[PDB]
Design a protein around this nucleic acid. Structure first.
Ligand SMILES: [Mg+2]
Ligand SMILES: [Mg+2]
Ligand SMILES: [Mg+2]
Ligand SMILES: [Mg+2]
Ligand SMILES: [Mg+2]
Ligand SMILES: [Mg+2]
Ligand SMILES: [Mg+2]
Ligand code: NA
Ligand code: NA
Lengths: 156, 343
RNA sequence: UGCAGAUCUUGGUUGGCGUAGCAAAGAUCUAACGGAAUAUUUUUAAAUGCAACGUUGGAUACUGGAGCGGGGAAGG
RNA sequence: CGAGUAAAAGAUUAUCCGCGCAAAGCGGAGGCAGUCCGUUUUUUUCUGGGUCUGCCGUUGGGUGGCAUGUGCUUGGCGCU
RNA sequence: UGUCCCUCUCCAAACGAGAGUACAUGCAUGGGCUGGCAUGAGCGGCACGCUCGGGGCUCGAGGGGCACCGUCCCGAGGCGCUGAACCUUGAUGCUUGGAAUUUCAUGCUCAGGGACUUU
C-alpha cells in the first residue's frame, strides 16, 4: 500500500520546462536541466542512490578519521582514552556492531605521543567477520601513511 | 559597515563623511493564503471566520505535522474537495458577506518560502506563519485588496520604502541560568568576603518578613521578546540572480555583491532580496524577525533625512580582511605555486 | 497496688532521605586467558543482557637514592 | 442526569437557498423504477439504472503568468 | 489517524523543556575559498643546479685540519628549490542554484525499531 511509485511529476515538469525553452534569449541559467557542475533539478539526490542487496557479512573498509575536531579543548589527561572510545563508536555505527577489537598496532599509534598528544588524523583498516543466531564483530588496525591528502574512503 | 555623507545644518559633521554599522537581513517573498476578519465586542475582538486559498504549497502544509514524511499528509484534503463546488462557492460568499457587514479589522494569513531561501544552516523546512493587518480605506476596499492578493507572492519593496524607518520585533540571544551581576548589573563585593563576592549583600529588611519582587535574584537571562523603535532603512536590494552588482554605488564602481569574502560566518550567502537596516537588531543569525510600520510619529529631521550610500564594505569577517574583492587579492599575490602547477 | 509529659531510665521504631555527600598524594589503555558472572529475545547484524573483576604480553606514565628501595630497636 | 451563549431568528428556530429594514416585494430548484418502514400533508428512508452543471483524480496536447524544478491559469480527451 | 522514546543537528539548554530533521548534500572523507603563522624536511655550490628541446641568466661564509701547490674535509649562520610547510569547525567558518580558460567530488543508508492512543 505504501508503494507509491509515482515518479511522474518529474516526468511532467521536465517535459514542460523543455517545452518553452524556445525564447528570443533564454537566460534562465539553471532552469534547463542541461548545466555543468550542478545538481539535477526536480528530484532529491538520495533518489539517485543505487540500491542493491544487503552487503555481505565479510567486508573490508579503509577510512580516515578526523580526530582533532572530536578533541577540542578536552581535558588533557583524558584525550587518549577518549579517542579510543570515539573510534569505537565511529566504526560501530557504520558496521552496525557492538563488538569492536582495537588491536595493538592502532592502540600503540594513538598513545605514541603521550596522553595529551593524540595525532590529528588517522587511517584505519576495518574488517567485519561473523561466527556462531550469528554474531558479528569488527577488527580495527592501523595503516601508516606519509600524508593524508587526496585520500577517500574505499571498500575492498 | 558603510560610508555616507550627512546633511544636517548646524552640526559639526554637516557635509562630511561618517562610518555607520548596518545589519543585513534576507527577505524572500511571502505568500498570502488566507483572510480573517474581526469584530469588536464589549470584551474584546473576536474572530468571525477564515477564507482559505484553493491551492497551498507543501511547505505551508508541513507546519501542521511533527513528522511530515511519515504521515498520511491529509491536511486540507477535504476542503479542497468541497471549496470549488456550488455549495462551496455559496459558503465562501456567506463568510465574505459577514466580513463586509460586521467586521472591524481585516488581516491576511501569510507564510515564508524556505525553499527559495536555500540556506544550508537553517534546518527548518516548515514555513513560518503569521498575520498581517491591512490598513487604509473602507472595509469593502480592504476586502477587495485581500481577494486580489490571495494565492500570490508579495515582495518587500511593495511594503517598505528606502530612507524610511521601521520597528523590529525579535527574541534576543539566550544565556541560560545567570547570576545577579550579569543579569541585573549589581556591584561586586570586596575581596575579603567570606562565601563569595558575586552576590547582593542584603535582600530585605526585617519587616516586611518576606522577600519583595523588586530585589535582584539569579535566573534565566536572554531569550526574551523585545520591540525596538525607529530603525532607518538604508537599502532595499534585489536578488543576486537578477542584478549582480548589489554593493556597487555611484561613487564606488567596483562590481561586487553584498556577501563578504568568505561568506557570513555561520550563515552563508545571501541569495534573495534583502534589507539593510542601520544599527543592530535583537537575536542571533539565522533567526526569523518581523518588521512593522512605525508607531511613533515620524517628523524629526533625523527620521526624514534622505540616505545616499557612498561605500559598502565586503572584506572578510574572518580575521582582519584587507581585500574588498577576490580579484584584488589575486592582484596583490602573483601566480602562486598551485597556479604554476596548472600552467 | 492504677502514668502523658520529670533537658525522666532501658529497648524498639522513625520523617529528614535514596538526601548531604564518598573531590589532597597527576592515569590509565589494549588483546588473550580465567570466572556462573555471556554474544542470555519467539511475543540478519545496531536501535531488547548493561556495568564491573584477576593473571600474562604489549603501550603509557609516576616514585626519583632525605624513594609507595633494602635491613633493625620500641610496640605488635 | 442541576439545562442561563456579549449565537441565530420561527410548521416553537423543524420544512431549501439569494436580495431586501425581524420590511414591502422579487428571484433559483432535475426526472424515472423499485425495495424497507409507516396513524398524512407530493410519508421516511435504503436501494437501481438512465444525466446534466459546478468539481476530483486522470491521457496527452499545446498557450501563458509567477522569483525561474512547482505548482497554477488556459484549451480538449475519457473518467467518476 | 496521531503523539512520544531510541538514532541525527544546534538559533536552546544545570536536568526537564525548546527549535528542527525523519533516506534529507543527512552524515563522513577529500578538493577549492576565506583566514592564521612566517618560509618545512632534504639536497646543492659557475652547472650536468635555479630562473626566463634549444638559447639568455644567477650562484655565501668568521675560521680550522689532512695529504707533496692546488685538491679533499670540519664550521654557527646565509642563499635557491619556497608567501614553503602546517592548521582552518570542532560547543558546532563558507562552497554542490548569479557568472567565471574550474569549483565542487566521491562513499554510506537498502520495509527504521519500540510505547501509547479503548481511538
Ligand atoms: Mg574572612
Ligand atoms: Mg570577525
Ligand atoms: Mg507507659
Ligand atoms: Mg548526591
Ligand atoms: Mg568534601
Ligand atoms: Mg613530581
Ligand atoms: Mg619523574
Ligand atoms: Na574563614
Ligand atoms: Na625509604
Amino acid at each position: 500500500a505504501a508503494e507509491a511509485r509515482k515518479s511522474r511529476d518529474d516526468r511532467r515538469w521536465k517535459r514542460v520546462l523543455a517545452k518553452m525553452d524556445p525564447e528570443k534569449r533564454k537566460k534562465y541559467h539553471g532552469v534547463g536541466n542541461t548545466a555543468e557542475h550542478s545538481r539535477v533539478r526536480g528530484c532529491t539526490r538520495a533518489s539517485l542512490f543505487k540500491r542493491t542487496g544487503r552487503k555481505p557479512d565479510n567486508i573490508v573498509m579503509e577510512a580516515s578519521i578526523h580526530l582533532s575536531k572530536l578533541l577540542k579543548k578536552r581535558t588533557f589527561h583524558k584525550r587518549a582514552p577518549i579517542a579510543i572510545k570515539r573510534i569505537r563508536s565511529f566504526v560501530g555505527k557504520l558496521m552496525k556492531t557492538k563488538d569492536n577489537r582495537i588491536d595493538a598496532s592502532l592502540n600503540t599509534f594513538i598513545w605514541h605521543k603521550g596522553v595529551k598528544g593524540v595525532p590529528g588524523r588517522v587511517r584505519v583498516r576495518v574488517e567485519r567477520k561473523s561466527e556462531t543466531r550469528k554474531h558479528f564483530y569488527t577488527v580495527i588496525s592501523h595503516i601508516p601513511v606519509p600524508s593524508f591528502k587526496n585520500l577517500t574512503t574505499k571498500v575492498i | 559597515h558603510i560610508v555616507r555623507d550627512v546633511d544636517r545644518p548646524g552640526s559639526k559633521v554637516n557635509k562630511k563623511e561618517v562610518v555607520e554599522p548596518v545589519t543585513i537581513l534576507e527577505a524572500p517573498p511571502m505568500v498570502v493564503v488566507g483572510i480573517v476578519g474581526y469584530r469588536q465586542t464589549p470584551v474584546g475582538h473576536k474572530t468571525i471566520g477564515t477564507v482559505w486559498a484553493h491551492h497551498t504549497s507543501v511547505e505551508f502544509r508541513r507546519r501542521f505535522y511533527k513528522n511530515w514524511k511519515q504521515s498520511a499528509q491529509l491536511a486540507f484534503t477535504k476542503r479542497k474537495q468541497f471549496a470549488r463546488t456550488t455549495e462551496g462557492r455559496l459558503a465562501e460568499a456567506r463568510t465574505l458577506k459577514a466580513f463586509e457587514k460586521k467586521a472591524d479589522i481585516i488581516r491576511v494569513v501569510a507564510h515564508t518560502q524556505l525553499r527559495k531561501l536555500r540556506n544550508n544552516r537553517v534546518g527548518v523546512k516548515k514555513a513560518h506563519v503569521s498575520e498581517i493587518q491591512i490598513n487604509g480605506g473602507t472595509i469593502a476596499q480592504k476586502i477587495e485588496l485581500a481577494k486580489s492578493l490571495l494565492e500570490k507572492e508579495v515582495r518587500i519593496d511593495s511594503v517598505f520604502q528606502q530612507s524610511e524607518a521601521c520597528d523590529v520585533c525579535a527574541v534576543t540571544k539566550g544565556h541560560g541560568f545567570t547570576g545577579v551581576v550579569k543579569r541585573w548589573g549589581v556591584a561586586c563585593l570586596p575581596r575579603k568576603t567570606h562565601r563569595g563576592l558575586r552576590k547582593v549583600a542584603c535582600i530585605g529588611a526585617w519587616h516586611p518578613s518576606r522577600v519583595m519582587y523588586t530585589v535582584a535574584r539569579a535566573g534565566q537571562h536572554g531569550y526574551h521578546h523585545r520591540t525596538h523603535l525607529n530603525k532607518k532603512i538604508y537599502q532595499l536590494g534585489r536578488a543576486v540572480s537578477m542584478e549582480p552588482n548589489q554593493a556597487t554605488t555611484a561613487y564606488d564602481l567596483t562590481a561586487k555583491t553584498i556577501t563578504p569574502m568568505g561568506g557570513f560566518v555561520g550563515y552563508g550567502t545571501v541569495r534573495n532580496d534583502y534589507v539593510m537596516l542601520k544599527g543592530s537588531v535583537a537575536g542571533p543569525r539565522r533567526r526569523v524577525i518581523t518588521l512593522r510600520r512605525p508607531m511613533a510619529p515620524q517628523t524629526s529631521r533625523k527620521l526624514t533625512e534622505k540616505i545616499t550610500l557612498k561605500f559598502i564594505d565586503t572584506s572578510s569577517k574572518i580575521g582582519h580582511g584587507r581585500f574588498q574583492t577576490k580579484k584584488e587579492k589575486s592582484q596583490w599575490y602573483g601566480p602562486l605555486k598551485k597556479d604554476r602547477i596548472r600552467r
